[PDB]
Structure 1
Amino acid sequence: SRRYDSRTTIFSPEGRLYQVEYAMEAIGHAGTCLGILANDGVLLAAERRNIHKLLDEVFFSEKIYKLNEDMACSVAGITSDANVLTNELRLIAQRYLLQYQEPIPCEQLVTALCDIKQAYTQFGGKRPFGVSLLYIGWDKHYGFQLYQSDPSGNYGGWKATCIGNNSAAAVSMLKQDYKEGEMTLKSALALAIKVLNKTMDVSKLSAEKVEIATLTRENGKTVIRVLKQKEVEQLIKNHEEE
């Protein structure tokens, strides 16, 4: 038994957690996920990996999951691991609503999931979840928000951020193009396309290679929708002329 134990939750000689770092390596090669916060909403733009011609389309999306009435998330890393965490997020949100009869504040939902992730890195002997997430949501305390969390159990709030393939280069572009408090959903969508065009290495951006979701407030209610091919195609056209 001791001879086969891989010892996933122990400190290495230089105080590092190897399994957590190795899981971060996996997230770095996965599809690009970017989140941008604007004055009138938030958006999620993710590169699609499933692009084969014989693939069928019948779900809400591929990398964007609705968590509750006012929150959505995007994942990067192990697909099957993401399904487990996304289902857990939904339960946490519903449990909060059952108890207080109010939608769970965005940051509280992220923190609850990060607690589960941290637990895997400290005890149990299991390998950690190889997922990084981006959260977009609206709540009555802070309005429109954007969060990013990783396998170690750490999370942070952002105005614009990126995870996955070439996220370091995507973050650089965002720093020089994002205008604090002067961004709009239309202007955020253009930036997303611009950033996505650079990080991705396939010349023509293509509407079939991406998925975009926006979160806005309409008549006192949150509206989350995935942009259709037409709208996405038009956005790509704009960049060409841009």
Structure 2
Amino acid sequence: GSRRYDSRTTIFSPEGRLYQVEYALESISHAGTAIGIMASDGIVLAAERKVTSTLLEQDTSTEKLYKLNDKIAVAVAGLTADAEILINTARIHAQNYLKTYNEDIPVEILVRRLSDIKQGYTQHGGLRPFGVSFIYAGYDDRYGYQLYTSNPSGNYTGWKAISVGANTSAAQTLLQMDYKDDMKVDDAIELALKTLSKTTDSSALTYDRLEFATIRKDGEVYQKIFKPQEIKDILVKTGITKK
């Protein structure tokens, strides 16, 4: 029958490793770098666009940063289409939680739901996993500001600062060097921009090659996706470009 063509995507290697999970992580390793930093009063997400050209529109472009609800956002590294599938499911689950409990979904619950969705593909169904890694930046009343990551294995972890995609080792070393616990959100913006500029593969770091977002505080939490002009302003403000 068809059993000869079945690649068996949900089997174990003799070492106890999932072939497809490892290969999808290797795939994500070539994706644009994304960084999340959790300050004491905010969270910062930054990412570099792998797709670059003079003719690419940036105003209407959303490739790496996505809104899940009004208090949680994601930085994406990997297959953007699998990412959009998972983001749609996550938005639906957040709105389900809202309809059921009349409260915004706690960040870890949403992250765990999305990680369970990811893990399902690695145990049954005989389908390929999602070639996407996520950095979730969120806020809830129970734990405050939260930063999580999720890889195709379905495993998820919580971080003060973290990076996914290309040059994760260099970015993680730089963050471990320059991260302090009591820092504010603006210092985190500066640190994220510095790490992206030091780990980029391009000549210089411009506004057109990166996406930026901040979840900060009026007693309320505001989620800001940075526009190209705001990105250019913050770049010239942190001393990475001039005018």
How far off its partner does 1:34 sit?
0.2
Q: Deviations over 1:82-127 (max 9, x none)?
A: 1100101101101111110100000000001111111110111001
Q: Is the 8 A contact 2:36 2:162 kept in 1?
A: yes
Once the two structures are superposed, the pairs formed by residues 62-141 of structure 1 within 5 Å of their partners are: 62-141=63-142
Output the CA distance in 2 between the equivalents of 1:240 and 1:167.
21
Q: Deviations over 1:22-63 (max 9, x none)?
A: 000000000000000011110100001232122224536321
Q: Aligned partner of 1:221: which letter?
A: E
Output the CA distance in 1 between the equivalents of 2:118 and 2:230.
36
Identity rate, percent: 53
Question: Which residue matches 1:224?
Answer: 223
Q: Aligned partner of 2:4: which letter?
A: R
Question: Which residue matches 1:191?
Answer: 191
Output the CA distance in 2 between the equivalents of 1:29 and 1:62.
15
Structure 2 stretches of 5 or more lacking a match?
Answer: none
How far off its partner does 1:161 sit?
0.4
- TM score, norm. by length of structure 2: 0.94
Q: Is the 8 A contact 1:190 1:239 kept in 2?
A: no
Question: Which residue matches 1:30?
Answer: 31
Output the CA distance in 1 between the equivalents of 2:240 and 2:23.
38
Q: Is the 8 A contact 2:58 2:228 kept in 1?
A: no
Output the CA distance in 2 between the equivalents of 1:170 and 1:239.
19
Q: Deviations over 1:158-182 (max 9, x none)?
A: 00000000011100000010001x1
Structure 1 stretches of 5 or more lacking a match?
Answer: none
Aligned residues: 239
Q: Is the 8 A contact 1:31 1:48 kept in 2?
A: yes
Task: Determine helix, strand or coil for the equivalent of 2:189.
Answer: helix
Q: Which 4+ residue blocks in structure 1 deviate beyond 6 angstroms?
A: none
Judge which range, 47-56 or 122-131, deviates more. Answer: 47-56
- RMSD between superposed Cα atoms in Å: 1.4
How far off its partner does 1:222 sit?
2.0
Q: Is the 8 A contact 1:194 1:239 kept in 2?
A: no
Q: Aligned partner of 1:124: which letter?
A: G
- TM score, norm. by length of structure 1: 0.95
